[PDB]
Amino acid sequence: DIQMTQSPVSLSASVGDRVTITCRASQSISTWLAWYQQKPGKAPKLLIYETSSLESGVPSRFSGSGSGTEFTLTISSLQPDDFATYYCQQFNSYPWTFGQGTKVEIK
Amino acid sequence: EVMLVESGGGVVKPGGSLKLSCAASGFSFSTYAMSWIRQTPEKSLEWVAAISSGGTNTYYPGSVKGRFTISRDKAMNTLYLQLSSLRSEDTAMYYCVRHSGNYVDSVMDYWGQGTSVTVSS
Amino acid sequence: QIVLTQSPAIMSASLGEEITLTCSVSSSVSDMHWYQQKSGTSPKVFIYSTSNLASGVPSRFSGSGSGTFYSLTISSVEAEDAAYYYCHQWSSWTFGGGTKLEIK
Amino acid sequence: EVQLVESGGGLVQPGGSLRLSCSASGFTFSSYAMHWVRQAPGKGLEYVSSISSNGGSTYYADSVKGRFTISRDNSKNTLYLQMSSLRVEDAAVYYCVKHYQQQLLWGGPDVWGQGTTVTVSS
Amino acid sequence: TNLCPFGEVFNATRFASVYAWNRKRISNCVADYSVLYNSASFSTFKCYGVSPTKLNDLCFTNVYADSFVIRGDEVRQIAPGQTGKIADYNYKLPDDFTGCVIAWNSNNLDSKVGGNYNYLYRLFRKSNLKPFERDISTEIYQAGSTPCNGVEGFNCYFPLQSYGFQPTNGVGYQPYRVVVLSFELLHAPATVCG
Ligand SMILES: *[C@@H]1O[C@H](CO)[C@@H](O[C@@H]2O[C@H](CO)[C@@H](O)[C@H](O)[C@H]2NC(C)=O)[C@H](O)[C@H]1NC(C)=O
């Protein structure tokens, strides 16, 4: 039961901004983390897997980083098809504890 | 300064055999490993032959092991790739490649210019 | 065995802007090299050990990554970067696909 | 083309029962262990249940276990989620995920389903 | 002038796997490291604190030869200071080392056409290794609040994965045999001189 803090919980960012969303655990997992992107109204989609590996078919502007306790996602230039929420999820310990949510509304 | 040329490419018969020569001079030849890198005309490169620096370690992939015998002679400072019993998959652009370390593990620094080989009648 | 995949097939970013390239491995490898060919010319080396620029490449190129994901990103692309960019490692026997970066 | 889809769902009074279904096609079903993950509406995600590659081992979260059971069928390409002793906290959508690996269980989901709305009322 | 057994540690008929490697002590010997150096059949002959050509007129008191088999790409992690899978879970060298690390290719020797599944390596461990420390413990591993006691269920996994050693694998995934020649100096007379 490794509860993960995902911060900031809500922000806004215009088109072309470099945004960074960080996800920090309590117990130190070892590079077993995956991100997601949940468009409002349907299922999540696996974007980043194993903390660095970009999944196929995903635009390459997404890039996960970080190792140890805290982990960070970043987007180079924000596109108008990315106003969704991004959850983080560990899978080191087998009880899976997901993130909190980040409602990125574009202003 | 450093330069590697290829000569001996043409058209051969299916099932035919010939020898691709790669002349090399300008650097210390017997202290570096070298390799052959081929390119099918779908422009997808592919490792095809690898020799060590001294000559005691020779490496081939699982498809051409038993058809391609690499060679090395430090007297004339050349490199020979003895092709034999060619299928329809060996129509490619063959390159001569110099490594950086004393083994095949290091990066490929300098390349040749390229020779044309095709398997057609 | 290892197949090295690059996606998508042909990438395009407009002049002076930032693009990045991917080279995804089916297992874990330590390093990753990046060779580059132009049209009708033999390929040449740009990056050895994922982060070191070769003697001859401009110093705008970079890249990082370890394990199962390797990168080559350009902070501001130029018109001479109209080429194929092949990734390759020690442990493959087969090169990457090659995302032909053409300008937009 | 790997794809998952579920059916069932609906409403149930507290204390009732419901069996869910996860019918998958497009991959080797017996070599890929699959799990359920739920999400209350307007809230975050949550993990609920799982199963091994051949129905050998199961592991649920401690907050739900005892009242649930899972079952799968390698001959029918289906996965079932049989619920009993239902409460108000289970009123959620129930996605169906699958593994990135084969027969090893130590991590990584690969693709997610579409979910089917389960809610409770009176 | 009776030379030391190095024909027992190098051209052996079967090495051991890395998670239980083979430690062998050298005593009452006279070696000649130039024959090791001027054989030119080895791929990576790196010495880490003594110069290799001056090794013959350097008289020690005990030499330890460790032998194991790793992947070809992981020979970088048998150096002082490197970390990775093998380095922090299988065979860790201390960062004050003085010895010679030897490596050469062995595909023909350790690879069947179906593939040898008897070379294994440690994948899961609680913490890292202090140096020169083997851990042959076939107990299952565990993560959050509940222990397994041998069930091998979810959250519990065998601490070993198998090397896949096929004859068409790559020059960097072929099985490489390494030998970590390691020197010491105890308060004792000179026993190996050269
Ligand atoms: C392990 O055994 C081989 C087989 O004898 C040794 O190879 C010999 O090496 C000596 C030293 O140069 C040569 O004179 C022989 O001709 C080699 N024998 C051959 C080629 O059959 C090898 O040196 C041995 N390893 C060690 C560490 O001594």
Numbering used by the authors:
A (entry chain E): 1 to 107
B (entry chain H): 1 to 121
C (entry chain L): 1 to 104
D (entry chain C): 1 to 122
E (entry chain G): 333 to 526
From the paper:
The substantial and rapid development of mutations on the receptor-binding domain (RBD) of the viral spike protein has resulted in the diminished efficacy of currently available vaccines and immune therapies, as most were developed against the wild-type (WT) or early emergent variants. In this study, we generated two SARS-CoV-2 nAbs with potent and synergetic binding and neutralization efficiencies against various SARS-CoV-2 variants including early Omicron sublineages. Cryo-electron microscopy (cryo-EM) structures of the mono- and double-antibody-bound immune complexes reveal an antibody-binding-induced rearrangement of the RBD. However, here again, we show that, despite with theoretical collision, Class I and Class IV nAbs could simultaneously bind to the RBD and confer not only synergetic neutralization but also rearrangement of the bound RBD.
As for 3E2, it mainly binds to an epitope on the opposite side of the 1C4 epitope; a similar binding mode is shown for nAbs S2X35, S2X259, VacW-209, COVA1-16, and CR3022. The binding epitope comprises a total of 13 residues (A372, S375, G404, D405, R408, N437, Q498, T500, N501, G502, V503, G504, Y505, and Y508), of which D405, R408, Y505, and Y508 form seven hydrogen bonds mainly with the light chain of 3E2. It seems that the larger the theoretical clash volume of the two antibodies, the more serious the structural variation, indicating the allosteric loop as being a critical region in the coordination of simultaneous binding. This structural information not only provides evidence for the existence of multiple potential cooperative mechanisms for synergetic neutralization capacity against SARS-CoV-2 but also demonstrates the rational design of antibody cocktails using Class I and Class IV nAb combinations.
